[PDB]
Design a protein around this ligand. Structure first.
Ligand SMILES: [Ca+2]
Length: 384
């Protein structure tokens, strides 16, 4: 009848009452687990512990001592790839995860819809925009130069977690023109064959169109340039057309991922930080995935002194206190050291006094060190 948890004065070790007699315990977490409620230990003179038929140690060894947690408000989760020696041989990428509010400026901001990051992963190159990653080839020497980028710009390494965090928004590459070259069946000049590009001067500059088998397709100047570079069909300049010719021809759509603006390949030495931010204010809404580029980590210079390089881990963890997170659900507790411990059922977390687990992206939380699983079965193992 108590009271069921005690601490010594000389050693301050935790003791829990089991049915009739007490057992010592590795951590407070295991005690609050085996009890089923978040109660605090009672400091006690060693002689009290002495005059008692003691059992032996139970609980979970590699479990966190306690389970403290910060607040929210926001559930911010960022994953940054910083790069050292961005012109070596022999380069190296230092990655990091952030679960604290960010300090975003103009030296580390999300990519504008015209700038992108050349990247390399598993022998195959990719390109990163605000949306995600797109497959690309840097071997076809001329094919690369068709869109702003040269070959004098080489890609740069990227971590696995970063690669898997970026949604594969397909490849770059202008869509296939299956009938390209065949006599145009729309009445236009025969030298303006299918797959050719022509221009019409509207009220806001010229407008470029590709001759498709089932009509004509509006494209941005970059797509026009790329198409012409691939195949111009014996045409020096895209033949100017006057509106009243195609004003009656069926208008069609041509995907083309190329931006209307020119392409600004960021300089990884001058812009080493490549991050993926994930947000959820409070309302249901949807997660807000955005890719950032910059000079440094999107946190305060002070926060840089909070980086816990995971000893047997993958990334440096920047963390403002403990977190209680829910994926998908599958729930986890993150200790201030940046280690995820599995929290099974909803009834279990009530013992640790944990409530309202924030939503967090599994893409980021999975990079955290997977510790033991906080369960009642695992917390019932005797040791000498
Ligand atoms: Ca920028």
């Amino acid at each position: 009848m108590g009271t069921s948890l005690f601490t010594d004065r000389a050693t301050n070790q935790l003791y829990v009452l089991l049915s009739g007699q007490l057992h010592p315990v590795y951590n407070l977490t295991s005690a609050r687990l085996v009890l089923g409620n978040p109660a605090n230990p009672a400091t006690v003179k060693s002689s009290e512990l002495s005059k008692l038929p003691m059992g032996q140690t139970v609980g979970i060894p590699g479990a966190p001592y306690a389970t403290p947690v910060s607040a929210g408000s926001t559930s911010i989760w960022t994953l940054c790839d910083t790069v050292a020696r961005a012109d070596s041989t022999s380069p190296v990428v230092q990655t990091a995860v952030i679960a604290m509010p960010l300090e975003i400026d103009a030296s580390i901001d999300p990519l504008q819809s015209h700038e992108a990051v050349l990247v390399s992963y598993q022998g195959e190159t990719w390109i990163v925009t605000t949306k995600g990653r797109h497959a690309i080839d840097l071997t076809d020497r001329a094919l690369t130069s068709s869109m702003g980028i040269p070959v004098t710009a080489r890609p740069t390494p990227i971590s696995e977690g970063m690669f898997n965090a970026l949604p594969d928004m397909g490849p770059w590459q202008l869509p296939p023109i299956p009938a390209a070259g065949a006599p145009n069946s729309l009445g236009l000049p025969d030298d303006l064959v299918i797959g050719s590009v022509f221009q019409i001067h509207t009220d806001k500059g010229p407008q470029y169109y590709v001759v498709l088998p089932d009509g004509i397709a509006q494209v941005n100047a970059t797509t026009a340039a790329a198409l012409r570079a691939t195949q111009a069909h014996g045409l020096v300049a895209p033949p100017a057309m006057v509106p009243s010719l195609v004003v009656r021809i069926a208008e069609r759509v041509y995907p083309s991922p190329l931006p209307d603006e020119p392409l600004k390949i960021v300089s990884r030495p001058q812009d080493p930080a490549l991050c993926w931010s994930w947000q959820r204010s409070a309302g249901d809404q949807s997660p807000q995935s955005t890719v950032l580029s910059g000079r440094h980590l999107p946190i305060s210079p002070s926060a840089m002194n909070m980086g816990i390089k995971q000893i047997h881990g993958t990334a440096t963890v920047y963390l403002d206190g403990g977190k209680f997170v829910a994926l998908q659900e599958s729930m986890y507790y993150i200790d201030p050291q940046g280690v995820r411990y599995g929290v099974p059922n909803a009834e279990t977390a009530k013992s640790l006094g944990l409530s309202s687990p924030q939503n967090a992206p599994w893409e980021i939380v999975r990079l955290l060190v997977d510790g033991p699983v906080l369960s009642k079965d695992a917390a019932l193992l005797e040791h000498d």
